[PDB]
Each structure stands twice: as C-alpha cells, then as structure tokens.
Amino acid sequence: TTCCPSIVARSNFNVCRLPGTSEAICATYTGCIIIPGATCPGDYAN
C-alpha cells in the first residue's frame, strides 16, 4: 500500500498513524507514494 526506499522515510507517517492527521496525506508527504494495489512505480520497488 506504501512503497518507500526505507522505513525511516515512513517516519513522517508516524503523524498519520497517530491521533493527529496534520498532513493527512502523509503517504505523499513521507516520500512514499499512493499505489493502486501492491503496484509500486518501480522508483522504490518495495
């Protein structure tokens, strides 16, 4: 659901998983991107 180069890059998503939702679309504001269905763009291939 979320392809990233590293897990550390998903550190920004810690604000999404938490009761805050400041950015809301952390998936995008976390380096990662929004995939359709387990279909990475290949940029990260993770």
Side-chain angles (χ1 to χ4, degrees):
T1 305
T2 305
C3 308
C4 243
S6 68
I7 198 265
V8 171
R10 310 197 198 212
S11 182
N12 309 277
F13 201 86
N14 293 341
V15 183
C16 258
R17 78 191 295 285
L18 253 62
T21 314
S22 177
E23 309 310 287
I25 318 114
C26 311
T28 302
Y29 209 80
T30 192
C32 317
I33 66 267
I34 302 171
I35 80 190
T39 290
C40 308
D43 297 312
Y44 300 135
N46 182 3

